[PDB]
Amino acid sequence: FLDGIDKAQEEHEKYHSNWRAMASDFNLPPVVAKEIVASCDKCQCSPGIWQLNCTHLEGKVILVAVHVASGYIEAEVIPAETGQETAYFLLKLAGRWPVKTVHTNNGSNFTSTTVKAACWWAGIKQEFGISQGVIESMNKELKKIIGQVRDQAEHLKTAVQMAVFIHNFKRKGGIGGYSAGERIVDIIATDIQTKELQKQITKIQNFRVYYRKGPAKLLWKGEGAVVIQDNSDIKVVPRRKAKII
Amino acid sequence: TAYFLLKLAGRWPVKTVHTNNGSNFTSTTVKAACWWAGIKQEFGN
Amino acid sequence: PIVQNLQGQMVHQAISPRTLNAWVKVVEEKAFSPEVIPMFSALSEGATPQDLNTMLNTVGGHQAAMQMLKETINEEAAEWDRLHPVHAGPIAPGQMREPRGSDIAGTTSTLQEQIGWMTHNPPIPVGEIYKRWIILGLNKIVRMYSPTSILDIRQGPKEPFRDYVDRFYKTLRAEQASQEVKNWMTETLLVQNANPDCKTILKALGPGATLEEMMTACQG
Amino acid sequence: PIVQNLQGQMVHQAISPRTLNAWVKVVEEKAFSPEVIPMFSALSEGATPQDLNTMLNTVGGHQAAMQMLKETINEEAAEWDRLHPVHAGPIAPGQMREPRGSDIAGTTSTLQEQIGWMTHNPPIPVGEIYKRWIILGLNKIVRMYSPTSILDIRQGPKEPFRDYVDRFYKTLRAEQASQEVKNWMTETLLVQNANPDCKTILKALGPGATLEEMMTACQG
Amino acid sequence: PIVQNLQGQMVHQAISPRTLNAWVKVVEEKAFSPEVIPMFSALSEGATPQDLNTMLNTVGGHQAAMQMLKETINEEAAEWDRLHPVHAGPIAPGQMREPRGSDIAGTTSTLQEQIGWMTHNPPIPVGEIYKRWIILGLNKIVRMYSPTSILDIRQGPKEPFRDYVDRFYKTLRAEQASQEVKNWMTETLLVQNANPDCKTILKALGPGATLEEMMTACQG
Amino acid sequence: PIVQNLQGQMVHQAISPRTLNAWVKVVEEKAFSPEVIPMFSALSEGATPQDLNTMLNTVGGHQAAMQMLKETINEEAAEWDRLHPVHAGPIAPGQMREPRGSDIAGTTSTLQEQIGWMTHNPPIPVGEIYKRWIILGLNKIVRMYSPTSILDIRQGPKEPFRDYVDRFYKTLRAEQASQEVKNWMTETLLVQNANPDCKTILKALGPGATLEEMMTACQG
Amino acid sequence: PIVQNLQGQMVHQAISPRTLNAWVKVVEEKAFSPEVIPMFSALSEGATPQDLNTMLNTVGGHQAAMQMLKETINEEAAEWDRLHPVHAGPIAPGQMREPRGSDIAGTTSTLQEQIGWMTHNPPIPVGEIYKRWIILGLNKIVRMYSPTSILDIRQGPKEPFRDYVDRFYKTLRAEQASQEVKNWMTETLLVQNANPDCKTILKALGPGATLEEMMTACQG
Ligand SMILES: O=P(O)(O)O[C@H]1[C@H](OP(=O)(O)O)[C@@H](OP(=O)(O)O)[C@H](OP(=O)(O)O)[C@@H](OP(=O)(O)O)[C@H]1OP(=O)(O)O
Ligand SMILES: O=P(O)(O)O[C@H]1[C@H](OP(=O)(O)O)[C@@H](OP(=O)(O)O)[C@H](OP(=O)(O)O)[C@@H](OP(=O)(O)O)[C@H]1OP(=O)(O)O
Ligand SMILES: [Zn+2]
């Protein structure tokens, strides 16, 4: 806040970011951030769930992939519509992020030989036909930020990359006011630590609980409740009628 | 090179970078690209 | 290649390795873009049909177009054989009869016959006829490799029209229409298929407006 | 092109692949900056109009510039036809009549006509006239391709005057005007729109001094 | 360029594209370091002033130094004209008048006049003089690109003396001054700007000693 | 540089740009190592001192070595002037006195003086003397740029003899001394500084054994 | 090197930088495989001993091989001195001193007397003798760089016979042997060391069959 108004103005003249981003990053009250936004003439699921789609912009085809559970985006303008570039983008996004499922349509390029080879090589599950409202809203938001930044852009690729860079970091999301990158980092880190801790205790703790049936294994005991799993089915019972051995 | 640097910035947050003195690394385009993203450019660990 | 000696006589020479290396690398780098069509005539000046065949055989891959051009060469050789009456009888010393289809194709005529025909008076531009046949084959190959037509191209609502007109002319050069039709389309299509503001400015300018004034009027 | 032998005559030669490759790569890489204007004259000395036409045709992309060059060549050919009307009467043996506009453009004239005209006594500078027409076309195309004018160059507050005057001279050289007008620009506009501190320093220095004092004055 | 026939007379030839490409590449790629002074003098062993101008104006970017050298060339031409005015009166047949300032600058004189001057008896190395003029400007150009002075060089606490003395000699060579003052400063400023340990070691060796003993003591 | 002419008197020749490009490339890519000594003599055969200075100034960076070699050149020139009788006074046409200490360095002598000296009868190999002075400077600066010694190379228990003898010979060539001491060290140190197994093998082989049987016995 | 002038006589020339650069880079980067032996004989044709030793010592790396070949050159010089009687006596015009072992190595002789030997009648092929000595040394050093014997090549159970026979032939060529023993080995060893299935297949095929039958039968 100490002389941060000047920095906020000099960075909003270049980014045109939302008021909450300036408030959180630069430690400014929301009122002055909203005033800065107004004063600008240009402003008024599992982690593997990824959706890829094709859009048309100024006579150019663009393939854009979105992380459904975190809002992360990645777009690239394909020069000539062919499945080879679709497969190249798929393998690049696989090499940059772990993906377990693909949500695309039944297009010819989506079912290309190279795309199928790449998806089989990566072991990614394929699901044709599809939540889409979030994809459409992100598409319109990227279109409007592209329109905003096109005045200072020379080519389409640079403008698209600038829009992606602004959207993924300089835009606070929903719950908690966290950007797409923060959300995806948080969710993948939490998944990693939870799976580590879950795999850590399986070797040590092994108890057998009888209820009402069979030798089920203890999963969680406390708060007057026993949750267990038997025959790949999870059952929750009260503390009564449950013997722990 | 500036396009690749912009892609890297769009994927991960970068604050500073150390690089050698190659001809393409000292060009005006990469200088403008790092001026945009506010990358602390250092030549020369 | 056949290069005239300095204050001497035209003597046949071997093809330089670097020229054919450049030809094959530019063929493999580009997917038979129209710009390679003039470049061919920039590399095969005064070359015997045997040299043309040797240069043609250097291509790696893209054999469908090579088969198509070979078929068109064969049919053109048949047409040349059928249109020109075949002289029969003794061969005059120092000269030779009209080349056959396989002779103009260069697959049977020896180098000595090619040299004799080149030095024959009146001149025999058999190599030039073969080069023109190859040019026609390359034109139809470019038509084969055209990814889209010209009448279906559209201009983006917010696209700067510089790239629009650039790609419009790039696609236009690939067209195999008559010159008058080309003039008509380059006068009507681009002015009738623009953005509303630029099209309004152009129709205000009226007909007979050169493309320089066309683009300077729509500058933004 | 056509090269002169050691104390000999002017003999034709095929186009060197290195020259055309360098030309096309420098055109692609350097876009349409003015510094390519001299390079063209470095790669076209003693060359036939056919060679210039081939070199213009080899470059791919930017087809609007090529179309504008073609139309300017056509109108210059019309001007040549208009200033030198169609001659009549038999031509003496060993001589060829004055080339038409199409012959100068090279669209209807074979290389043999160029060879005859170049070696004719007195020499016919058809190639030089075509080169000058291409130079005028390139001048107008680089005037067209200039991103902005010269009267709107604004110096940033934190921007040092080094790159400011560099781009000011870039736009000045990109502008086509008279030598006296350019001198007036370099005398007034360089200081009339500078940063206020440098403006005051230059006013303290006094008009009528070399720009070396200007660059050594406002350092920092 | 200007060459001599084998046991014959002097002739003029076109400029090799390779040399111009290498010159422009080496100028643009690295920097405006002092090694441009030898490199340029290694690519102009005999050429007309028009050739020098063509080699000069092809540079892309950094037009500020180009304007500096153009202004220095103009003032040198003016001073040459005022100190040695071209004598008036009749001109003897078979010769031509003395080149003017515009002639040595190459702005107005044609290539034929330059060739005639080079082959004249006695020969006029006017273009060569022009080259030396450019050299003078180039010196000032290096003064443009010196980032520091001859005194603000200091050795870091973790910086070995190798790159320290390398930078010191680089800045000394970038300095345009007398040789005697350079010798005076290289015998004194080296020890003053050195880390205390090796500084005191080399002082114990003896002041004014050559760098051989200094570097043998400063090892590690 | 200096080119021998076909049954004719020698004439001055410029330096090919590729020669300088290769020289600067090999200087930059590899640090100061003995292998640059032959390469130098492979690019400066019969070259004039001016050409030697021009190619020496082309280097970039490492100016400390350049200053050291300039100092050694100056001291060698002073010694040469002291040992040979100084010359002065007028000389008959077609002849001139021997080059001074500054003339052999090329800092005051012009190209014409060097040409006259090399074409003199009998010729004066001043260029060869300057080249051998440069060779001595290169030897001493390669000795300067050798970090490791000859008496410190050790063979590891698992280290093969191949790279051991390789580095031994690297250091042997990097060290400048008499031939006899080089033979003594290359006969004694290699066996005296090896693993015990190969040491006993070589002792069994006996003194004075050839290197081939030595290394085919130590191998394994 | 010494080259044949067009319709002229033998003329000495320096080594082009391209040839030596290509030689050193291919030697350092590709291998010490025997296929480099023809390459050398394709580069040193019509050379001089000075050029031979300059090319020999320029290449860096693997200096143990350089010392080995120097030792073999010294021993071959001793052999030449001892087998060929040394004729000591007066030297008359039309004759020069007898070639020596050190003269063949180009150590005690300079370039001009080597040229005189080349032009001397009767011709003295000292360069050819040095080249064949280098060939013998290179054969010894390529024998040194064969890590495996010829009797230890065994086909792996899962190893395809293609690369197996390829490396078998490579090691056979690298092996120093006569023609008849090579024929015996290529007739016996390959079938005596194959996989059992192809072993029985080729035994069923029987003798008197070329490698085509063996390779068509061992597939699968
Ligand atoms: O055009 P490329 O296929 O890449 O080959 C070039 C070309 O060599 P050629 O003229 O023999 O084909 C260069 O010559 P120019 O482009 O200047 O006409 C040459 O340059 P130098 O001869 O001056 O070395 C260069 O070599 P380099 O890459 O070392 O600069 C070499 O490339 P390659 O060496 O890779 O074949
Ligand atoms: O040796 P050649 O087969 O006759 O080819 C040469 C050679 O070029 P390459 O080494 O690239 O093949 C010359 O280079 P130098 O050997 O003289 O260094 C080159 O001269 P430039 O590279 O300086 O242009 C010359 O070209 P030109 O005849 O134009 O002087 C060119 O001859 P070609 O043009 O016939 O290939
Ligand atoms: Zn805004």
Q: Please say whether the beta carbons of A80 and C147 come within 8 A.
A: yes
Beta strands in chain D (DSSP E): 2-4, 10-12
Q: How, if at all, do strands A125-128 and A101-104 pair?
A: parallel
Q: How many helices and strands, by DSSP H and E, does chain B display?
A: 2, 2
Residue A156 Cα, gap to closest chain C Cα (Å) = 10
Which two three-digit tokens encode residue B38? Answer: 């506010």
User: How many Cα atoms are found within 13 Å in the side-chain-facing hemisphere of D155?
Assistant: 22
Interface-testing mutation among E3, E163, E169, E218, with chain F (most F C-beta atoms within 10 A): E169
Q: Are A16 and A148 in contact (CB under 8 A)?
A: yes
How many CB atoms lie under 10 A from the CB of residue C70?
14
Q: The tokens of A68 are what?
A: 């459904």
Length of chain G (residues): 220
* Burial zone of A73 (CB within 10 Å; 0-12 exposed, 13-18 middle, 19+ buried): buried
Please return the burial class of C91, using the count of CB atoms within 10 Å of its CB with bins 0-12, 13-18 and 19+. exposed
Residues of chain D whose beta carbon is less than 8 angstroms from a beta carbon of chain E are: 3, 6-7, 18-19, 22, 30, 33, 35, 38-39, 41-43, 45-46, 162, 165-166, 169-170, 173, 186, 210-212, 215
Closest CA to A55 of A78, A88, A85: A78
Which of G57, G118, G149, G176 to mutate to probe the F interface, most F CBs <10 Å?
Answer: G57
Count the helices and strands in chain G (H runs, E runs). 11, 2
- Deposited resolution, Å: 4.6
Query: Hunting for tokens 């419009």 — which residue is that?
Result: C168
Q: Determine contact, residues E99/E126, Cβ cutoff 8 Å.
A: yes
Please tell me the distance between residue A175's alpha carbon and the centre of ligand 3 in angstroms.
23
Q: Do E63 and D7 touch (CB under 8 A)?
A: no
Can you tell me the distance from the alpha carbon of F138 to that of C187, in angstroms, rounded to the nearest whole number?
Answer: 72
Q: Extract the tokens encoding F13.
A: 């020749």
CA distances from residue C208 to C162, C173, C183, C213, E149 in whole angstroms, order as listed: 20, 21, 12, 10, 64
Task: Give a three-class secondary structure readout of chain F.
Answer: CEEEECCEEEEECCCCHHHHHHHHHHHHHCCCCCCHHHHHHCCCCCCCHHHHHHHHHCCCCCHHHHHHHHHHHHHHHHHHHHHCCCCCCCCCCCCCCCCCHHHHCCCCCCHHHHHHHHCCCCCCCHHHHHHHHHHHHHHHHHHHCCCCCCCCCCCCCCCCHHHHHHHHHHHHHHCCCCHHHHHHHHHHHHHHCCCHHHHHHHHHHCCCCCHHHHHHHHCC
For residue G57, how far is its CA from the centre of ligand 1 (angstroms)? 26
d(CA C218, CA D64): 15
Degrees to nearest 5, angle at CA G120 with G117 and G126: 40
- Which pair of structure tokens corresponds to residue A1? 């806040």
Contact with chain C for residue A58, Cβ under 8 A: yes
- Superfamily holding C148-220: Retrovirus capsid C-terminal domain (1.10.1200.30)
Within 8 A by CB and 6+ apart from A244, the residues are A207, A208, A209, A218, A221, A226
Domain coordinates in residue numbering, chain E: 1-147, 148-220
D83 CB contacts (<8 Å, ≥6 apart)? none
Q: Which residues of F touch E (CB under 8 A)?
A: 5-6, 8-9, 11, 14-15, 17, 20-21, 54-55, 57-64, 66-68, 71, 144
* Closest C-alpha to E196, from E171, E218, E212, E169: E218
Local structure of A90: helix, strand or coil: helix
Rounded Cα gap, residues G161 and G195, in angstroms: 8
Whether C and A touch (3+ CB pairs < 8 Å), yes or no: yes
Count Cα atoms within 13 angstroms, Cβ side, for F204.
Answer: 9
Extract the tokens encoding C211: 């493309």
Best substitution site from E16, E18, E21, E25 to test ligand 1's pocket, by max atoms within 8 Å of Cβ? E18
Nearest-angstrom CA–CA distance, C3 and E112: 30
- Own/partner pairs, F66-70, CB within 8 angstroms, 24+ separation: F66/E169, F67/E169, F67/E211, F68/E211, F68/E212, F68/F137, F68/F140, F68/F141, F68/F144, F69/F134, F69/F137, F69/F138, F69/F141
Instruction: For residue A157, list chain B residues with Cβ-Cβ distance below 8 A.
Output: 3
Task: Find out whether the beta carbon of F21 lies less than 6 Å from any atom of ligand 2.
Answer: no
- Cβ distance C158 to A147 less than 8 Å, yes or no, reads yes
SS3 A26: helix
If residue E209 lies in a helix (H) or strand (E), which one and from where to where? none
> Is A151's Cβ below 8 Å from some Cβ in C?
no
What is the distance between the alpha carbons of residues F22 and A203, in angstroms, rounded to a whole number?
Answer: 67
- Cα of A239 to nearest chain B Cα, Å: 49
Touching, F vs E (3+ Cβ pairs under 8 A): yes
Q: Which two tokens stand for residue D23?
A: 């030309």
Question: Is residue A16 exposed (0-12), middle (13-18) or buried (19+ Cβ within 10 Å)?
Answer: middle
DSSP at E108: S
Please tell me the CATH superfamily of domain E1-147, with its number: Human Immunodeficiency Virus Type 1 Capsid Protein (1.10.375.10)
- In the structure encoding, which two tokens stand for residue F117, read together? 């000296």
Contact residues, chain F, for E19 at CB < 8 Å: 17
Q: Whose structure tokens read 């076109």?
A: E14
**B7 to chain A: which residues are within 8 Å by CB?**
161
CA E83 to CA D129: how far, in whole Å? 39
**Beta-strand relationship, A125-128 and C10-11:** unpaired
The two tokens of residue E32 are 């405006």
Tokens of residue C129, six digits: 């006829």
Distance from CA of G197 to the nearest CA of F (A): 34
Longest dimension (CA), chain C: 75
F219 φ, ψ (degrees, to nearest 5): -65, 145
Distance from CA of E183 to the nearest CA of F (A): 11
Strands (E), D9-96: 10-12
Question: Is the CB of F18 less than 8 angstroms away from the CB of G14?
Answer: no
Mutational pocket test of ligand 1: of C16, C18, C20, the residue with most ligand atoms within 8 Å of the beta carbon: C18
Instruction: Specify whether the CB–CB gap between E60 and E127 falls below 8 A.
Output: no
Contact A61, A54 (CB under 8 A): yes
CB G6 near ligand 2, within 6 Å: no
* CA-closest candidate to residue A19, choices A2, A40, A3: A40
Ligand at minimal distance from the CA of A15 is 3
Provide the 10 A C-beta neighbour count for residue F133.
Answer: 20
Assess contact for D175 and D193: CB atoms under 8 A: no
**Cβ atoms within 10 Å of D140's Cβ, excluding its own:** 16
Which among F37, F51, F50 has a CA at the least distance from the CA of F134?
F37
Which positions ≥6 away from D203 have C-beta within 8 Å? Answer: none
User: Is the torsion defined by CA of C71, C77, C81, C83 positive or negative?
Assistant: positive
Give the mutation candidate from B6, B30, B34, B39 for the A interface (greatest A CB count, under 10 A): B6
The token pair that represents E199 in the structure block: 């500084």
N-terminal to C-terminal alpha carbon distance within chain G = 53
Question: Which among E6, E42, E170 has CB closest to F63?
Answer: E170
Token reading at F92: 């008959």
CB D2 within 8 Å of CB D127: no
Nearest partner of C130 among C105, C108, C107, judged by Cα: C105
- The alpha-carbon gap from C197 to the nearest alpha carbon of chain D, in Å, equals 21
Backbone phi, then psi, for F102, in 5-degree steps? Answer: -75, -25
Which own/partner contact pairs does D169-177 have at CB distance under 8 Å and 24+ positions apart? D169/E63, D169/E64, D169/E66, D169/E67, D170/E63, D171/D146, D173/D34, D173/E63, D174/D34, D174/D142, D174/D143, D174/D146, D175/D143, D175/D146, D175/D149, D175/D150, D176/D139, D176/D143
Q: CB-hemisphere CA count at 13 Å for C29?
A: 8
Please say whether the beta carbons of E57 and E118 come within 8 A: no
| E16: three-class secondary structure by DSSP | coil
